[PDB]
Design a protein around this ligand. Structure first.
Ligand SMILES: C[C@@H](Cc1ccsc1)NC(=O)NC[C@H](Cc1ccc(O)cc1)N(C)C
Lengths: 336, 232, 281, 217, 53
């Protein structure tokens, strides 16, 4: 009863303190920065091995190999330089909505409608890729998963829950339960010490991995949050949603910084990533093409239009040399 | 992982004989297979190779025509048939595993060996020294030279370093001139540039004395080095 | 005389239409549909074969224009080969498309196993190889002769020509008119008989309009084939059977029959490419 | 020029042909999506077949292989994962005919049927509707008429009319009757004719897909 | 109704956060974006010699 009014008053205090900590907008500060100019990105490679729509994709830290997962029951690992298929792992469940590629390169992970995260050991004897481990405990479809190291893995599921697992033990070590809607995205900080997670309640929560409690909560979207990605310095992140708008928040300022939106855009976001320096924002849409925004000027600096269906996954190499976009036409495009 | 091969023994010269290499413990169908022989008083020499799926076969110029190589993937077996077996083909034959993708470690596992006995353009790899005195706890550096620059346009320097202990099959140490094979202690290190390579062993612990071989992999046929012996 | 230029003009315009149409069809396939489905290989094959067959038309135009063969033995030991080979390739790919559609409609579960893009390529190359069985003998046989006036090149055989040339005519008539018709008509008849009893084309007048459209396009395809290949075949048979004396009427009729024979090839991509609802996208 | 890369390219091509043959094998198998409200006959039709958030049931019938996907054991926002099932051959929707009076239940069943039939992803996917528990429905109408569920019902409280009225109510929930077809069958346990009905509907939709592929349609 | 206590406790914990002025955060963002401008192949088109794609 009175606790609801207490929560209302606390939210009141939070947002007029956030207003009290706002002086000038990002646009007002960055009006003095020269625009990046119209950048033209040409497709350099087309990885054509998948038969169904591609749902996930992840780059290696060496920025050469990339893993991609399709609904045809296969996740395959490509050498992007030569377009050769290094590996082709068949999945026990054809319903895969996420995949991650370990920073060491020794493992890959996948998951989906089966509520199980499967870790495959790439670098083993016997010359085959075998299921190193299966993680169960989530009661909803897995939306995302990232590798903290060779033994710690963070998953987000559609049961409004994120979890940190010890792979060797095989069971959850931490359970983050703050969201109310289905968690659909995930992004680790560059230091892999805290991470953000955007859910279907139009809210993005920031979690401290070590202690397991939510630090800050960010609102501002009207619809489901589909993608999230930290800024390279780790002090900001961008989110995309179904209301066809992206927005850049800030941790220390604790409030939204910029809103990337165009009246010509009416289709929701599916994937968000920054560039090497953070000056560009790459956003994948349902209108079958990617957009490149000036992250500081908030104007569409470019368009990546080469896909015949919606772009479902998008990633940028660690060295920033290229950007890979997957889509529902079963082809990956490596742009540079 | 085991590759046990048989089919040796005394053979009348000019006849025929086949060697069978049975493999158990790995996905045999996904590995390319090599036959490499070592004469009773000489170094290693590449004989034959079949790719995965038998789609590509190569033979050394010495045994081309006389020798043929095949595989039975469902039975996980490797076959080398030899016809007109002259007296220069008496040697110990080794069954070698090698898988080629990006960042793989080919030539990583070797069989134990048959002991066939017959009664009576190529890149040249030169290990200048042949025998080196060594004291435990010290550091040594085996050298290798190449007639052609092993460095390729894509940045890979295809040089492999193998170690053969007395009475044992050779063991992979270094692949592509810098990478350590799995299970190899970090004391070994590889370095060098085109046509000049070095294998450095630091704080040399014992029980690794043997013959060090220096093999190229830029072009077929694969030519080994002469061999460098480490003795206490 | 006027008809001497009118007939070669007809040849040239038919050739231009056939070329342009088939080149456009192949370009559209390779640039927009990319030959991805199980079909769209057959349409590409048909367009290629029709273009190749129509490419010879200027040669028959020149031959009639000057009444001789200026191109010598170098070319018509292979352009007659091209013509005879491509007529069979186009006819057999038409039959293959008809059989493909019959299998797809009247045998669904078996079509699941059979008709795949790889098998489409296998059947395509098989058709080309089998048509080589007439492409090659006509290549080894089309020796140039010395005509009554100056020159011409036809097919010559050994003793007896009484038994070999008529055998070739009967064989080409049987394996290019009788079998193709008895295949495509039967297959497209059984397909419509099956389609009459499909719940997606039964009521709901829009669906009846769809069924009428499907059967109409099938019937127009078969009718075009019949009307385009019957005249030349019957003219060849009557010429080989009953003597016909030369006049201004027999030559124009014969050239008109040849024109219709290649008119099938030029009009074929209108029926099989521009009437395809996959191309209407 | 491709010194040790030739073996890498050969491996790439070989695993590519394995991918091609696996996809060809998977393309010859009919996928069905099983849906329906809770406590319905959704489970009892799997027993009619010869036979965790996803359930897969493989069964073969007359040289045709069916993968039936049950998704009811997953509580999440359906719009976040239903697009995964786009391109499924057919949707088997189970409705309990004996729940017209219990709680109303057919109101939620019709709401779910309307939501899933007119969905942006299943705009043309055929629906096979299984009206289960028809035998139990016999004595439910002798004591409780159809008027409770349907206020505007005007007819004799007989199976031969009430069941037909219910089927007509269910089938008229699609706005695209010219592009999608709804097959209805009152589930019977006699000689497993349900599998035959599924086979017939799947054959019709396969024929339509083939007609679309060949461009005839 | 035990969720209300956790919700209000978490809201109270989130309230006691030392905010930073938006001007300073924006300045830090632009300083980071300009300090690494040269080390970003996507911004400045790299010559084909150093481009692996
Ligand atoms: C003038 C003649 C020779 C020539 C000159 C340059 S190239 C070929 N050209 C022709 O006869 N063209 C018709 C044939 C069809 C046919 C069918 C059955 C027969 O018994 C005889 C012919 N062609 C369409 C394959």
């Amino acid at each position: 009863d009175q606790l609801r009014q207490e929560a209302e008053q606390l939210k009141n205090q939070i947002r007029d303190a956030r207003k009290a900590c706002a002086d000038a907008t990002l646009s007002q500060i960055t009006n003095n920065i020269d625009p990046v100019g119209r950048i033209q990105m040409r497709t350099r490679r087309t990885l054509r091995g998948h038969l169904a729509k591609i749902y996930a994709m992840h780059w290696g830290t060496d920025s050469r190999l990339l893993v991609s997962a399709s609904q045809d029951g296969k996740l395959i690992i490509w050498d992007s330089y030569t377009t050769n298929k290094v590996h082709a792992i068949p999945l026990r469940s054809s319903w895969v909505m996420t995949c991650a590629y370990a920073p060491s390169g020794n493992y890959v992970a996948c998951g989906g409608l089966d509520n199980i995260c499967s870790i495959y050991n790439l670098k083993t004897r016997e010359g085959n890729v075998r299921v190193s481990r299966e993680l169960a405990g989530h009661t909803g479809y897995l939306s995302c998963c990232r590798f903290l190291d060779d033994n710690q893995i963070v998953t987000s599921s559609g049961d409004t829950t994120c979890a940190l697992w010890d792979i060797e033990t095989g069971q959850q070590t931490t359970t983050f339960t703050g969201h109310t809607g289905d968690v659909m995205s995930l992004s680790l900080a560059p230091d892999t010490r805290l991470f953000v997670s955007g859910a279907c309640d139009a809210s993005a929560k920031l979690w401290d991995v070590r202690e397991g409690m939510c630090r800050q909560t960010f609102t501002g979207h009207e619809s489901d949050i589909n993608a999230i990605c930290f800024f390279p310095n780790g002090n900001a992140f961008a989110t995309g949603s179904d209301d066809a708008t992206c927005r850049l928040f800030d941790l220390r300022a604790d409030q939204e910084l910029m809103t990337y939106s165009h009246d010509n855009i009416i289709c929701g976001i599916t994937s968000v990533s920054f560039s090497k320096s953070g000056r560009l924002l790459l956003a994948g849409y349902d209108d079958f093409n990617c957009n490149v925004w000036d992250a500081l000027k908030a104007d569409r600096a470019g368009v990546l239009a080469g896909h015949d269906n919606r772009v479902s996954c998008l990633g940028v190499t660690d060295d920033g040399m290229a950007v890979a976009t997957g889509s529902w036409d079963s082809f990956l495009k490596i742009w540079n | 992982v085991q590759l046990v091969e048989s089919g040796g023994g005394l053979v009348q010269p000019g006849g025929s004989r086949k060697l069978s290499c049975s493999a158990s413990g790995f996905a045999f169908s996904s590995f390319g297979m090599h036959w490499v022989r070592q004469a009773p008083e000489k170094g290693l020499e590449w004989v034959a190779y079949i790719s995965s799926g038998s789609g590509t076969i190569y033979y050394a110029d010495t045994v081309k025509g006389r020798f043929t190589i095949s595989r039975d993937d469902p039975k996980n077996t490797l076959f080398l048939q030899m016809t007109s077996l002259r007296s220069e083909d008496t040697a110990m034959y080794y069954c070698v595993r090698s898988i080629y993708y990006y960042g793989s470690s080919p030539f990583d596992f070797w069989g134990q060996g048959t002991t066939l006995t017959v009664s009576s353009s190529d890149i040249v790899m030169t290990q200048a020294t042949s025998s080196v005195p060594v004291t435990p706890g010290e550091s040594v550096s085996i050298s290798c030279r190449s007639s052609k620059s092993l460095l390729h346009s894509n940045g890979n320097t295809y040089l492999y370093w193998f170690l053969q202990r007395p009475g044992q099959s050779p063991q992979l140490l270094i692949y592509r001139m810098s990478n350590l094979a799995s299970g190899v202690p970090d004391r070994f290190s590889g370095s060098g540039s085109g046509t000049a390579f070095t294998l450095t062993i630091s704080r040399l612990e014992a029980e690794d004395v043997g013959v060090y071989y220096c093999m190229q992999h830029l072009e077929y046929p694969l030519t080994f080095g002469a061999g460098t012996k480490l003795e206490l | 005389l006027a008809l001497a230029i009118a007939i070669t003009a007809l040849y040239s315009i038919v050739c231009v239409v056939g070329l342009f149409g088939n080149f456009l069809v192949m370009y559209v396939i390779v640039r927009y549909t990319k030959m991805k489905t199980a079909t769209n290989i057959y349409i590409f094959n048909l367009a290629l074969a029709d273009a190749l067959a129509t490419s010879t038309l200027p040669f028959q135009s020149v031959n009639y224009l000057m009444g001789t063969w200026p191109f010598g033995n170098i070319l018509c030991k292979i352009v007659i080969s091209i013509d005879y080979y491509n007529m069979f390739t186009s006819i057999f790919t038409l039959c293959t498309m008809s059989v493909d559609r019959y299998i797809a409609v009247c045998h669904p579960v078996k079509a699941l196993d059979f008709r795949t893009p790889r098998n489409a390529k296998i059947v395509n190359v098989c058709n080309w190889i089998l048509s080589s069985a007439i492409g090659l003998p006509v290549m080894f046989m089309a020796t140039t002769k010395y005509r009554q006036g100056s020159i011409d090149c036809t097919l010559t055989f050994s003793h007896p020509t009484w038994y070999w040339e008529n055998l070739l005519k009967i064989c080409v008539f049987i394996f290019a008119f009788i079998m193709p018709v008895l295949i495509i008509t039967v297959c497209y008849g059984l397909m419509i008989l099956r389609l009459k009893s499909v719940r997606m084309l039964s009521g709901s007048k829009e669906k009846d309009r769809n069924l009428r459209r499907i059967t109409r396009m099938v019937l127009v395809v078969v009718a075009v084939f019949i009307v385009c290949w019957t005249p030349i075949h019957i003219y060849v048979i009557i010429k080989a059977l009953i003597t016909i004396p030369e006049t201004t009427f027999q030559t124009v009729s014969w050239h008109f029959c040849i024109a219709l024979g290649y008119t099938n090839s030029c009009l074929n991509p209108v029926l099989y490419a521009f009437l395809d609802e996959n191309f209407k996208r | 020029l491709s010194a040790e890369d030739k073996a890498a390219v050969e491996r790439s091509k070989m695993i590519d042909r394995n991918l091609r043959e696996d996809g060809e094998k998977a393309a010859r198998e009919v996928k069905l999506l099983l849906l329906g409200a809770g406590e319905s006959g959704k489970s009892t039709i799997v027993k009619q077949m010869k036979i965790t958030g996803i359930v897969e049931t493989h069964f073969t019938f007359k040289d045709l292989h069916f993968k039936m996907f049950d998704v009811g054991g997953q509580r999440s926002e359906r719009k976040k994962w239903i697009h995964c099932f786009e391109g499924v051959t057919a949707i088997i929707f189970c409705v309990a005919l004996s729940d017209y009076d219990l709680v109303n239940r057919m109101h939620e069943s019709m709401k779910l049927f309307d939501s899933i039939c007119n969905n942006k992803w299943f705009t043309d996917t055929s629906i096979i509707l299984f009206l289960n528990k028809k035998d139990l429905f016999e004595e439910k109408i002798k004591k409780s008429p159809l008027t409770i569920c349907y206020p505007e019902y005007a007819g004799s409280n007989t199976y031969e009319e009430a069941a037909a009225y219910i089927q007509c109510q269910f089938e008229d929930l699609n706005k695209r009757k010219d592009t999608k077809e709804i097959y209805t069958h009152f589930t019977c346990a006699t000689d497993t004719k349900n599998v035959q009905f599924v086979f017939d509907a799947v054959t019709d939709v396969i024929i339509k897909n083939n007609l679309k592929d060949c461009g005839l349609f | 109704i035990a969720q209300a206590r956790k919700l209000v406790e978490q809201l109270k914990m989130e309230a006691n956060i030392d905010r930073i002025k938006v001007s300073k955060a924006a300045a830090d963002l632009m300083a980071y974006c300009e300090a690494h401008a040269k080390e970003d192949p996507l911004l400045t088109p790299v010559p084909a010699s150093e481009n692996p794609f």
